[PDB]
Symmetry: D2
Subunit: 511 residues, 4 copies
């Protein structure tokens, strides 16, 4: 189980904390906790001497021109959480909320935010007890409102939130009492330090990146299966070809295709070249999101080695917004390449001998094997391609009394990226059924006998998930049940992700 | 209660059937039912003489080159529903499914599809009993799969669907038994006639249009309230101005503003000119969607006056796709105009004397009235503007074995339009709170005393929904609860829609 | 030759004035000129009594808070043209500038702007003498700067412009002297009245609409030729099909296809349904642009029947912006349908017997007939589809000291629409070559013998323009020369537009 | 002067060759030319033994199923250039054509394409003699047609092209004769090897990247000037802030701002955070484009160390397409940040004491200093933001007889990126005038006295280019002339690029 100490976290660990596959533990390192205490001491000394500092003794973003008298300082922080209670929309996936809580505790543990250690302890204990606040998906432009939901949940703020605990949704006060916590009154800068960052956007983005790495690996393995089913020529992946076009993505993709496996059409012959920018872009986005989520995004940065306060703009999530736009583009391009490959697989003009629509039985003249499934794929893929459009360009320049004239919209972009992830999971269920049926039909014409180890493992995982050519007569099964099973696996246990884990590990090691 | 007889339906009636505010009844007119029987007789005669007709005796779209022997004809139809069982994704709003069932029954009642009357009766009775099939949002490119869910539900097809009945979700077979229906075996062309149309896309679009008309009226009334709160000059809406720029939308919008109410900024002074294209476009989309949803979209069109079969492309939903793209644009532009007006309302540089962020109490120096609420609006509006991008342009040209090389993606476009409707409902809750607070503060500086009858009615409805200036101290309420109340009203009972019903009726009468 | 009197103009007349096929003449009607004189008298009376009126005695948009003393009133107008001299970018097509001059003179002739008649006379005389100011394509958000170029040109303002006259580009002062005009000093409100409107955006939009109507007709005729070349079944256009889906666009398109001419693929069988929304949208855009360009867009509207000044927002070009976005969408969809049809025509899997890539000679084994031409079409079409994205949504809310917080960007949208028109002209040259070659090859397998009157006329026009199956050996011609000839015809004399003039007239009569 | 030997070239050298600031020279290295000769020998041996190889003895992409007899082999290559003569549209900037010729010669010099050395010599000599073929901007989906123009120009192909030489445009045959070259008949694979790559797309992209690096540096310096003019607090760029958010772009941007120079608004306080993703993305695009342009993109790759032929997909320009989409996004975001900063600079609510619209003289009450200039900027910026939309997603899957079902559209994307570059050059002229005027007014309130060395150098360069606060009375100059001067400098000599060369060098050294 990971230890939270302010040290950088990997996207893998963040996603596993979000997935409840890892239980975070608070650090016992003396240096980290001493730095946190010293930061709180700097805040205390600034309050005691009535030093003029933004947030502590002034108003907030657009109304920072209004001074706050000392006796109201603490109240100001509480009042912050009162006016940030404007969270609406559909409820977020609790994985995002768990990841955000872990990331925020890790950020606060670096000793630049001036929080009390007890707030970090409450965050970590809520995460360990699986008392996860319900957070809705509207309210941030890139994170006062979504993070304010978590802050109000963990301090027992009178602006009651909803917290899921022990499988039931309850009031934040009830969950607080069940955790033997009392209501907490915020000290100076604490309420601002809990919400003035990019942790929630970074958490959604980290989940998107983890899923996208796994989905890229699964897409590549399904592509290898489809290429084998089409009888594609491995000549497209000879080392000489990528040696003369040394894009790292192309080299890694060609090496993967070599491991997994007059001229073919481009979707087969130019596969590594098509993959190269997607692979490299996903790697770049992974690195940038990992850098952002491990940064201290609080605005008043406290340096305890000098005892100074620094104005900051580290709460701006422009990088997360642009990275999520790019990630949506990558998912759309992967989906479109898979759709082109499937269109090749279903059409006898391009089948190279496969039955039309990959029908399993020729004896029933009215069998239409995977025609409706192809229509489902054709309905899903353009949604991903459409989500390839960028949201960052539409950012409001009038936001928050014209004070936040650049924001970024990393929150909306990350939620769109998660929508893309869900759509691509459904699409990959469709593509998995297409790949398995196509390879079975190809084996019959000449399934596991045609496939390498990783592709065989994925094929067997798909066969076992569906409890089983794959499809023989149209009336012998319901493809809806199979699609639900594969999608639930991709969203849940991830046996298909385990089946292609060698490719994912290769991508992580290379990039 | 409406009578379904194949006569054209209004979008209002379709939406009220979807909303369970109207219970459809099957017609007892002898001519309509006799035409349905004669159409089925034409199908029977074509089957008896083994006439070669698409769908009845041939394969389906991409595999229509394969003939079907007579003894399998009926089986083919059943088999259709077997291979179209590929519905996945998030579950649709049951309003869409009710509207689709009503529209499909109405289309089949026109006597061009060759169905048995008992299928129409089962559709109508499922609608009357409130046994609504669960339909997911992926699978159509503009409606075999989503309509196939309904067909399988009402005939008790072995590809089991999920049906919501008496408040509980059950298997289609259980609901069928509870309705005292037996399993039904499809005759020739019946399965194709149930699913080969645009009824589901048209139903989602009709719900979107109904909501968008109401939301346009509410937006206009909220704009009038905000203009009054800013102290805007009514000179912008003098009859002479629209008389010299005779866009119908501009004239109607200026007349509405006149009823509801050196130079102002453009968001106030050019309000009618800004509204004009939105008003006229919404009217055009209403008319086109109403035309599409009342059309016979079945491919083999049977003329009983001549007993002929006509090949058709009326199942293509290109018009619905483009209209929904335009409607999303209109909602985005309304949201952006409201956001600009709110940015004016919160900034003292443009307030014309209103407090910063519309704070209610100046005695508490740390009050930040609606700053977080403005941030929430700034997070919602760009999502609508982004959804202004068109989906129709991304349509797949390789779809369904390259046979459906033009499709349209009306299904995806309509689901995006409904997403826009939900986002704009949340946004209008935000804007309603902003309008009420701003008008209260303006009244204090100089609420209902400043407003006309319709605006006063909307203001009082908002006050009563929230059980109540509107906001005085930040800690005296939670704006999340108010936003939830207003959004639930807009999505549910629609008391705010009733408060502005005069404007909606004026729009319907004019356009 | 048209007479300009302030009466509404048709888009046809505006485009022909822009094309120099019509020479405008100033009206001699006593009522119109008397109204213009009375409007100028109202302005004079307002100046004499030092009445406080926006523009005349105040500052301009964002600086209207600054009063202007009477002795500087006239200077203010001149100074306006000094600070609006910020036109940059690529030079506009002179057709746009001619159309804008005609439209502005027509708008001023309605007697609401308070200009001297001599300014209107100078505009008309510059248009008649073909002394056309050079106007660049950047500077307007929807028309101070582009219209200011024309105003400075016709009054001899010290901010010198460039004017094309007698085939040579010269300084505005030189052209003024050659026209025997002296420098003109602006009176009150005159400089503002010359530039404070949507006339230039409306002129570009009117040219786009004229071209788009002609291009829609040409697209439909080329589609009929391609459908005949594929051996498509006319059953798709039977009156019964559109009778049961009564979209006006579908009915008109099916009637046109009937005149011009198991199941076909959708690009043929659903052609009328695909066209319907494009036809109706083009008609709607035509009507809205015609309404906008004939409106008085000046801000201070003077009513001479009451002698009053009215504040206006009629200078806002939101409708033009949205209509041009929609028109770009329509052109993109037409191009994509044509590209799908061409992809059908070149592939022997879908040719129905035509040679691969429409090669003319089978004896030369290395002939690749229209492969490069298809690649050219595939490079052009996605540019049009991409231009289907809307620009209006990106409008700046901070524009002009935050005073123009809603603008529209009709100028940029209209220039994008003209870019779409040019791209689609190139694309239609490509499609014309494809259609002619395909129909010749189809005739050989079973050109003018297969075609109706309008299609035969277009085929013969294409044959005569290229001085001539159409292509036999690859080395016997250069397709670049043919593409240049067809594109120059579409951009210039329009013999191909004359060949399909019956369809264009039918569209105008119906819509 | 650079030596072309097949070794990788820098984007700087490619752009300077395109700009005629460097004259390429062909290598005299024995190993490189010997490898080229050996590659041609491998091709000769394959032809002599009638070995079946794609391109040499088969048909081309979609028609490669058709064998070619030996006697026609050479003719096939010539015939290729005949059917690829389908180049249309607007003429490209000759910089792109020079860069493409240099890049293609460099690619062929690597000895994998099997060309004769004389073809490379003709390419290099055409480049050295400044005989540049006229190439139009339509015809490629990512480069047969645009590269075929160059090939036909340098070999004197009967499909005549237009070549600019000695300042005059002439027929390719005339220029060939003036260069003392005779017509050249292509040997096997040579015509395919000249055109089957990404060199032209890579050349346009390399020019875009060079310009974008310079424009990023200029944008950063102009931002520093505007921040100084607003009186922004340098606290936003303290090393502690970027130390705690270690994005490399943020660190480099903050270091640059430190060198060049209750809370500020975000456009000032979050400037480094906003820049970070743009800086890093521009660096990534530079690296990827440099990798692509130095790769061997020919399809039949010949290995002379083994004498083998390898099928390749290295002609696919997906990476160039996606990189150019991202670069357009980066330019749009830079433009929007500058527009937000200018909106701050012109509004007295946010000026911090500057005159409204940056008017120079308060004595003339009707002076509107840079209002029209701000409108021009507001018209340019949304075009760049709109061009931030991606084109790659719209790629045609039916292209070239469905054989090129994935292409990329790198050609269209790169041409769009160059359009963005031109728009941003115009925009930066506008922003330079705004910065100079603002800093002069700030100096008057408290220009070169407020600026560091690089900013002073840029300010003095702008003052010298315009021959000169900067603007005092509106009628004392024409801003159009100044904008033309600054834009011509940015497009031509680049004195403003020299003034900020330290920042560009810092960016190159860091990234």
């Amino acid at each position: 189980n990971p230890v939270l100490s302010g040290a950088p976290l990997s996207i893998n660990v963040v996603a596993d904390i979000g997935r409840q596959r890892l239980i975070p533990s608070l650090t016992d390192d003396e240096q980290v906790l001493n730095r946190v205490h010293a930061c709180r001491d700097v805040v205390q000394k600034a309050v005691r001497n009535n030093e003029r500092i933004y947030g502590i003794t002034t108003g907030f973003g657009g109304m920072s021109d209004i001074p706050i008298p000392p006796q109201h300082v603490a109240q100001t922080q509480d009042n912050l959480l009162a006016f940030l209670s404007t969270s609406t929309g559909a409820s977020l996936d609790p994985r995002h909320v768990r990841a955000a809580m872990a990331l925020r505790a890790n950020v606060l543990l670096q000793g630049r935010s001036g929080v009390r250690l007890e707030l970090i302890e409450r965050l970590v204990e809520f995460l360990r007890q699986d008392a996860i606040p319900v957070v809705c998906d509207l309210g941030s432009i890139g994170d006062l409102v979504p993070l304010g939901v978590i802050a109000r949940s963990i301090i027992g703020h009178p602006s009651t939130t909803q917290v899921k605990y022990q499988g039931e949704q309850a009031d934040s006060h009830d969950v607080l009492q069940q955790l033997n916590y009392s209501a907490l009154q915020l000290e100076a800068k604490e309420g601002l330090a809990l919400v003035n960052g990019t942790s929630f956007s970074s958490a959604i983005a980290a989940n998107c990146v983890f899923e996208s790495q796994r989905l890229l690996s699964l897409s590549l393995v399904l592509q290898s299966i489809m290429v084998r089913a089409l009888g594609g020529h491995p000549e497209a992946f000879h080392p000489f070809v990528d040696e003369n076009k040394p894009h790292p993505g192309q080299g890694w993709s060609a090496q993967m295709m070599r491991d997994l496996l007059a001229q073919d059409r481009y979707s087969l012959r130019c596969l590594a070249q098509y993959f190269a920018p997607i692979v490299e872009g996903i790697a770049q986005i992974s690195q940038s999101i990992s850098t952002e989520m491990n940064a201290v995004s609080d605005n008043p940065l406290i340096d305890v080695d000098t005892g100074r306060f620094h104005q900051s703009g580290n709460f701006l999530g422009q990088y997360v917004a642009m990275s999520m736009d790019q990630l949506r583009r990558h998912l759309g391009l992967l989906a479109k390449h898979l759709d082109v490959q499937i269109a090749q697989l279903v059409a006898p003009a391009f089948n190279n001998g496969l039955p039309a629509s990959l029908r399993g039985n020729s004896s029933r003249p009215f069998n239409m094997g995977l025609k409706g499934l192809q229509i489902t794929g054709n309905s899903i893929m353009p949604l991903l391609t459409y989500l390839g459009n960028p949201l960052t360009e539409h950012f409001p320049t009038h936001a928050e009394e014209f004070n936040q004239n650049i924001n970024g919209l990393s929150w909306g972009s990350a939620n769109l990226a998660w929508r893309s992830v869900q759509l691509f999971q459904h699409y990959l269920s469709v593509a998995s059924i297409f790949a398995v049926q196509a390879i079975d039909l190809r084996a019959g014409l000449e399934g596991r006998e045609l496939l390498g180890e990783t592709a065989t493992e994925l094929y067997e995982t798909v066969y076992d998930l569906l409890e089983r050519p794959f499809l023989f007569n149209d009336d012998e099964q319901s493809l809806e049940v199979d699609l639900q099973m594969l999608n639930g696996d991709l969203a849940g246990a991830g046996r298909m992700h385990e089946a292609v884990s060698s490719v994912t590990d290769s991508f992580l090691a290379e990039f």
